[PDB]
Motif scaffolding. Structure first.
Motif, PDB file in Angstrom:
ATOM      1  N   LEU C  91       0.798  -1.231   0.000  1.00  0.00           N
ATOM      2  CA  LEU C  91       0.000   0.000   0.000  1.00  0.00           C
ATOM      3  C   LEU C  91       0.825   1.274   0.000  1.00  0.00           C
ATOM      4  O   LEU C  91       0.477   2.228  -0.694  1.00  0.00           O
ATOM      5  CB  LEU C  91      -0.945   0.003   1.208  1.00  0.00           C
ATOM      6  N   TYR C  94       2.532   1.567  -3.368  1.00  0.00           N
ATOM      7  CA  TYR C  94       1.543   2.018  -4.327  1.00  0.00           C
ATOM      8  C   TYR C  94       1.357   3.502  -4.277  1.00  0.00           C
ATOM      9  O   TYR C  94       1.368   4.156  -5.316  1.00  0.00           O
ATOM     10  CB  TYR C  94       0.199   1.357  -4.086  1.00  0.00           C
ATOM     11  N   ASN C  95       1.146   4.020  -3.062  1.00  0.00           N
ATOM     12  CA  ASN C  95       0.907   5.433  -2.868  1.00  0.00           C
ATOM     13  C   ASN C  95       2.052   6.232  -3.434  1.00  0.00           C
ATOM     14  O   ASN C  95       1.822   7.198  -4.164  1.00  0.00           O
ATOM     15  CB  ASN C  95       0.714   5.757  -1.395  1.00  0.00           C
ATOM     16  N   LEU C  98       2.146   6.106  -7.347  1.00  0.00           N
ATOM     17  CA  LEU C  98       1.077   6.935  -7.873  1.00  0.00           C
ATOM     18  C   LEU C  98       1.340   8.398  -7.688  1.00  0.00           C
ATOM     19  O   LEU C  98       1.115   9.174  -8.617  1.00  0.00           O
ATOM     20  CB  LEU C  98      -0.260   6.572  -7.225  1.00  0.00           C
TER      21      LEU C  98
ATOM     22  N   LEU D  91      -9.062  -0.207   1.798  1.00  0.00           N
ATOM     23  CA  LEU D  91      -7.974   0.603   1.239  1.00  0.00           C
ATOM     24  C   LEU D  91      -7.665   0.306  -0.217  1.00  0.00           C
ATOM     25  O   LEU D  91      -7.414   1.230  -0.990  1.00  0.00           O
ATOM     26  CB  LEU D  91      -6.705   0.415   2.080  1.00  0.00           C
ATOM     27  N   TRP D  92      -7.676  -0.966  -0.588  1.00  0.00           N
ATOM     28  CA  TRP D  92      -7.437  -1.335  -1.973  1.00  0.00           C
ATOM     29  C   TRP D  92      -8.587  -0.979  -2.890  1.00  0.00           C
ATOM     30  O   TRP D  92      -8.356  -0.563  -4.029  1.00  0.00           O
ATOM     31  CB  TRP D  92      -7.102  -2.808  -2.051  1.00  0.00           C
ATOM     32  N   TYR D  94     -10.573   1.533  -2.309  1.00  0.00           N
ATOM     33  CA  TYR D  94     -10.465   2.975  -2.413  1.00  0.00           C
ATOM     34  C   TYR D  94      -9.504   3.384  -3.485  1.00  0.00           C
ATOM     35  O   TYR D  94      -9.829   4.237  -4.307  1.00  0.00           O
ATOM     36  CB  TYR D  94     -10.013   3.592  -1.103  1.00  0.00           C
ATOM     37  N   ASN D  95      -8.304   2.795  -3.444  1.00  0.00           N
ATOM     38  CA  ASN D  95      -7.261   3.125  -4.390  1.00  0.00           C
ATOM     39  C   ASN D  95      -7.752   2.901  -5.797  1.00  0.00           C
ATOM     40  O   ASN D  95      -7.578   3.771  -6.652  1.00  0.00           O
ATOM     41  CB  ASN D  95      -6.008   2.304  -4.132  1.00  0.00           C
ATOM     42  N   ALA D  96      -8.382   1.748  -6.028  1.00  0.00           N
ATOM     43  CA  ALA D  96      -8.935   1.403  -7.323  1.00  0.00           C
ATOM     44  C   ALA D  96      -9.958   2.429  -7.772  1.00  0.00           C
ATOM     45  O   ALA D  96      -9.908   2.911  -8.898  1.00  0.00           O
ATOM     46  CB  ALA D  96      -9.576   0.031  -7.254  1.00  0.00           C
ATOM     47  N   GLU D  97     -10.885   2.764  -6.881  1.00  0.00           N
ATOM     48  CA  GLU D  97     -11.957   3.689  -7.205  1.00  0.00           C
ATOM     49  C   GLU D  97     -11.425   5.031  -7.635  1.00  0.00           C
ATOM     50  O   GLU D  97     -11.895   5.601  -8.635  1.00  0.00           O
ATOM     51  CB  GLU D  97     -12.867   3.876  -6.009  1.00  0.00           C
TER      52      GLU D  97
ATOM     53  N   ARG E  54     -19.722  13.294  -4.842  1.00  0.00           N
ATOM     54  CA  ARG E  54     -18.951  12.096  -5.017  1.00  0.00           C
ATOM     55  C   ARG E  54     -17.992  11.879  -3.854  1.00  0.00           C
ATOM     56  O   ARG E  54     -17.850  10.742  -3.397  1.00  0.00           O
ATOM     57  CB  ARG E  54     -18.242  12.209  -6.357  1.00  0.00           C
ATOM     58  N   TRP E  92      -5.111   6.083   5.927  1.00  0.00           N
ATOM     59  CA  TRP E  92      -6.354   6.802   5.704  1.00  0.00           C
ATOM     60  C   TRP E  92      -6.192   8.305   5.771  1.00  0.00           C
ATOM     61  O   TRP E  92      -6.825   9.025   4.995  1.00  0.00           O
ATOM     62  CB  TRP E  92      -7.401   6.313   6.680  1.00  0.00           C
ATOM     63  N   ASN E  95      -4.572   9.297   2.451  1.00  0.00           N
ATOM     64  CA  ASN E  95      -5.529   9.308   1.366  1.00  0.00           C
ATOM     65  C   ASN E  95      -6.344  10.574   1.410  1.00  0.00           C
ATOM     66  O   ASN E  95      -6.506  11.233   0.381  1.00  0.00           O
ATOM     67  CB  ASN E  95      -6.440   8.092   1.429  1.00  0.00           C
TER      68      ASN E  95
END
Ligand SMILES: *[C@@H]1O[C@H](CO)[C@@H](O[C@@H]2O[C@H](CO)[C@@H](O[C@@H]3O[C@H](CO[C@H]4O[C@H](CO)[C@@H](O)[C@H](O)[C@@H]4O)[C@@H](O)[C@H](O[C@H]4O[C@H](CO)[C@@H](O)[C@H](O)[C@@H]4O)[C@@H]3O)[C@H](O)[C@H]2NC(C)=O)[C@H](O)[C@H]1NC(C)=O
Ligand SMILES: *[C@@H]1O[C@H](CO)[C@@H](O[C@@H]2O[C@H](CO)[C@@H](O[C@@H]3O[C@H](CO[C@H]4O[C@H](CO)[C@@H](O)[C@H](O)[C@@H]4O)[C@@H](O)[C@H](O[C@H]4O[C@H](CO)[C@@H](O)[C@H](O)[C@@H]4O)[C@@H]3O)[C@H](O)[C@H]2NC(C)=O)[C@H](O)[C@H]1NC(C)=O
Ligand SMILES: *[C@@H]1O[C@H](CO)[C@@H](O[C@@H]2O[C@H](CO)[C@@H](O)[C@H](O)[C@H]2NC(C)=O)[C@H](O)[C@H]1NC(C)=O
Ligand SMILES: *[C@@H]1O[C@H](CO)[C@@H](O[C@@H]2O[C@H](CO)[C@@H](O)[C@H](O)[C@H]2NC(C)=O)[C@H](O)[C@H]1NC(C)=O
Ligand SMILES: *[C@@H]1O[C@H](CO)[C@@H](O[C@@H]2O[C@H](CO)[C@@H](O)[C@H](O)[C@H]2NC(C)=O)[C@H](O)[C@H]1NC(C)=O
Ligand SMILES: *[C@@H]1O[C@H](CO)[C@@H](O)[C@H](O)[C@H]1NC(C)=O
Lengths: 103, 51, 174, 174, 174
Positions: C91, C94-95, C98, D91-92, D94-97, E54, E92, E95
């Protein structure tokens, strides 16, 4: 000729750095900076956090009072360091829940 | 003898960067461990050399 | 290029312009010259420095966490400790991945924005006295010496006093 | 539309243009015609293929993880195993979305970029020989047969040899 | 400003325009006036309301999770429970932080898009009858009373019936 000409533009660099973007795996920019610390010294700095070198003692041997760990009595640390060279030299023992106690 | 806010099993490291690839095991003010060995953050524009 | 200026309608970047990021290059009756535009240069730099500062800030000291390497087989409790840490790392990686991607794309694109912003500022400045040649250069339809060029850059160019000459030069036959 | 071209000043997309993404449609003394612009078409496709490739890459094999369904009540250790996995999934997801959202918005916007990039390339190409009609079309002020149109597309259009005619046609009264 | 309009070539925002977000302000032989453009105003609002809706949607009820405060020292199992939760929270928080950043930058930039979209719509509307003064205003080269201005806004302005006058006013000497 009663005329003139004016050009607008941006700079460039002889060399360049490849970076990643959304659309490109590699794209060249004038410069960039590295965000991942990929290398080390190999040596632990004794400041600012207080380091206690466990040397030939394990934390549990230092706790229980193994004779060769008398130097560790009543000592403190921000970070206790266990060495692979460590040994025990006292009565045979077993600490059920060893890992919990050490922690 | 030296000064460093981040300690790993591989020695202390600089915490001026945001991520690190030295060790998932750390102590103190350390960069986030990631799997990558490198991440270039662009600080300039698209480089278009003359020739 | 998103704004279509850098590697879009501008053919090359100027490797010899090392006093700024964006600038002017000209030719007239008094020869040729070149000088940087410090407004748009500084604007790009400010935006990038801002995001750079914002990315590169520290986190909380982290102190006594869990074990992440195990010398013995313990099964279920170890399985979980390994699973938690691994999850975490994926995770965070990934962050990071990205983050860099988004940031870099944006940096590429904001610097392209500043290029067109400068171009449009000049195009408006010059009103009807010059024409867009297509390659990031303008054709000036009046005599414009080094002093004149130094009024275009520096935004002190009154088009109205050249307007008359320029119109006559623009609207002839061949 | 961000660049304001697709569903912004262009009214409709061309359902009958199936040989490219962007292109030209014209009318002159020799009739009407239509042909795609392979430069801007390919540019949009390259960017999208790039991000598509970049999204769609595999991950590490994952081997012996934790149990995620439990046949018996175990309390605290199970509570945690469930909690860890659930956390992970949220969390995964979320990331995808978010990924899709950002990517899609960007794709929408980069293709709108390519539309205006093509339009501006042409507007500059034509200099003073044509006027922007507002709807994504240009009004050409000189005779421009099929061969002429085929010099505009393909970027071999010398405006200077038409300039004279065009100026006379542009500057009359009614 | 990315599109370079708000705090880019427009000097100030209109604190006295409280009937819309974007609009027109004018001066002619019949005095001065001001009125909002509901198209571009509503467009910005729709995009923002969309992303706002959203972002602000609820999540799943969460029921019996793990303990996150501990009254006694338990070591290894507690260490992990603390570690899991802490990990979660950092991710979190990240994000959220990033979400706001991206969204806000985009909101700043899409509203700047709508400003230039309106400006360009008008510039095309007016064809050759007015000139870009540089500051977000146009110089109209023909008499344009309040009724005329009310055909520009509202997009019912036929430039062709003013074209003749405008050209004569644009192409004189001084
Ligand atoms: C291309 O990419 C390169 C990659 O580096 C960029 O290079 C960086 O440029 C910046 C800006 O100049 C450099 O930042 C400078 O860092 C100096 C080092 O200070 C460190 O000191 C301790 C070390 O323990 C840290 O705790 C601390 O936080 C800093 O990290 C600073 O001293 C500089 O600030 C001040 O220094 C002088 C000293 O006299 C003062 O007089 C000034 O007022 C100044 O404010 C400055 O912050 C950065 O170090 C560079 N990178 C590297 C790796 O060194 C390029 O800028 C970029 N573009 C170009 C054209 O190269
Ligand atoms: C942590 O644990 C390590 C490992 O057990 C200790 O390292 C050993 O310490 C002992 C005791 O100090 C050393 O013993 C000395 O050995 C020298 C060499 O003899 C042998 O050394 C090694 C280990 O047996 C063999 O591999 C090698 O082949 C030799 O056969 C002798 O010269 C010494 O003799 C005299 O030393 C002093 C006087 O100088 C006195 O103690 C006596 O008078 C003694 O007669 C002594 O026998 C041993 O060498 C160390 N190991 C190594 C590899 O060097 C650490 O001491 C211990 N504590 C820490 C690290 O703080
Ligand atoms: C452009 O405007 C700036 C206003 O700051 C003027 O900058 C001066 O440039 C001259 C050289 O021509 C220098 O001697 C001065 O030191 C500069 N002053 C400052 C404050 O930077 C400049 O004069 C203007 N352009 C022209 C052509 O005069
Ligand atoms: C446009 O430029 C291209 C350059 O490649 C020319 O493409 C040729 O088009 C003709 C048809 O007119 C074909 O017969 C050729 O096979 C094409 N060549 C290639 C390499 O694709 C084209 O001729 C140019 N436009 C005009 C009007 O001549
Ligand atoms: C602009 O177009 C709109 C079309 O809806 C017209 O709006 C009217 O404006 C008048 C005031 O001039 C009002 O009395 C009407 O109630 C409005 N109608 C609607 C449906 O909103 C407007 O007339 C047009 N502009 C001009 C100058 O006539
Ligand atoms: C050379 O390239 C490096 C990246 O490898 C970059 O950091 C540096 O700014 C460049 N310097 C010059 C003078 O081009």
């Amino acid at each position: 000729n009663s005329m003139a000409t004016l050009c607008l533009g941006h700079h460039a660099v002889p060399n360049g750095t490849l970076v990643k973007t959304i659309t490109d795996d590699q794209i060249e920019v004038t410069n960039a900076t590295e965000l991942v610390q990929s290398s080390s010294t190999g040596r632990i700095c004794n400041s600012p956090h207080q380091i206690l070198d466990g040397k030939n003692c394990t934390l549990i041997d230092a706790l229980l009072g193994d004779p060769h760990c008398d130097d560790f009595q009543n000592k403190e640390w921000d970070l206790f360091v266990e060495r692979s060279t460590a040994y025990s030299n006292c009565y045979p023992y077993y600490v059920p829940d060893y890992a919990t106690l050490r922690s | 003898e030296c000064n460093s806010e981040c300690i790993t099993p591989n020695g202390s490291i600089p915490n001026d960067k945001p991520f690190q690839n030295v060790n998932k095991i750390t102590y103190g003010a350390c960069p986030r461990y990631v799997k990558q060995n490198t991440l270039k953050l662009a600080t300039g524009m698209r480089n278009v050399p003359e020739k | 290029g998103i704004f279509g200026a850098i590697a879009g309608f501008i053919e090359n970047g100027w490797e010899g312009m090392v006093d700024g990021w964006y600038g002017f290059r000209h030719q007239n009756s008094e020869g040729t010259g070149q000088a940087a535009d410090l407004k748009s240069t500084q604007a790009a730099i400010n935006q990038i420095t801002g995001k750079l500062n914002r990315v590169i800030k520290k986190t909380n000291e982290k102190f006594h966490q869990i074990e992440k390497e195990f010398s013995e087989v313990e099964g279920r409790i170890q399985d979980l400790e390994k699973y938690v840490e691994d999850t975490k790392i994926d995770l965070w990686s990934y962050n990071a991945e990205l983050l860099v991607a988004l940031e870099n794309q944006h940096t590429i694109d904001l610097t392209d924005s500043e290029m067109s912003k400068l171009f449009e500022r000049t195009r408006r400045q010059l009103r009807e006295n010059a024409e867009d040649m297509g390659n990031g250069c303008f054709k000036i339809y009046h005599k414009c010496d080094n002093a004149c060029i130094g009024s275009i850059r520096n935004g002190t160019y009154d088009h109205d006093i050249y307007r008359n000459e320029a119109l006559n030069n623009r609207f002839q036959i061949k």
